[PDB]
């Protein structure tokens with residue numbers, strides 16, 4: 001019953017651009033990770049907040065990973081059709097507000113349900129819930145984050161849908177501080193329409209069933225994770241000497 005209009009050439013170009021953008025900005029071999037400050041995992045079987053905050057053993061490495069990732073997200077965003085049509089001010093507002101959410105989205109490629117980890121190479125760059133606690137975060141963020149990762153995994157997104165979702169996430173007209181909400185919304189609509197059209201004509205059943213709505217729900221989930229991350233980041237930042245364990249970029253985006 002539902003019509004399946006074909007992707008317009010323009011929509012085809014948009015998909016090609018976003019796939020190219022992602023391939024240039026996401027390394028599925030994790031080959032740069034050895035350049036980050038080394039992961040350190042202190043003995044913390046009990047999950048002691050006092051100990052976690054006293055050491056922040058995993059923080060330098062995860063801060064470097066996140067900082068690196070923000071740089072990649074900036075590069076990806078610059079390639080979203082329409083993004084450069086925005087004022088610099090609006091571009092920066094969108095990047096700073098969406099960065100952590102896009103990181104959570106893009107991390108799904110490395111996430112595995114084999115053991116519920118982000119596996120980015122050997123035992124060294126395998127990141128578990130216990131590694132995030134060692135960077136000063138609490139289960140109130142990490143457990144819904146893992147749940148989100150599983151939920152996202154199970155949508156079995158085509159890469160086309162994955163890159164569209166990240167672009168839609170970034171170009172959101174409802175971020176605090178945006179100037180030209182109408183232009184951002186127009187850019188987002190073009191992407192949303194591409195995604196909806198793609199799903200309807202290129203995504204096989206039964207995985208296509210209400211997929212667009214499930215993807216929109218993930219965006220809402222990300223808002224919640226963003227809010228919790230920000231709250232926890234604030235508290236983490238109270239730890240004396242914490243700034244040294246972060247990066248200038250991380251400090252700007254989250255401070």
Ligand SMILES: C=C1/C(=C\C=C2/CCC[C@]3(C)[C@@H]([C@H](C)CCCC(C)(C)O)CC[C@@H]23)C[C@H](O)C[C@@H]1O
Pocket residue numbers: 027030059062063065066069103104106107110118120127132135137141233250
């Ligand atoms: C980054 C990427 C990756 C994994 C993401 C992870 C695993 C470690 C813990 C992270 C980084 C989460 C953690 C809660 C962020 C903590 C950030 C600070 C600044 C400490 O408050 C969010 C996403 C998680 C690897 C992937 O290949 C690239 C992706 O950008």
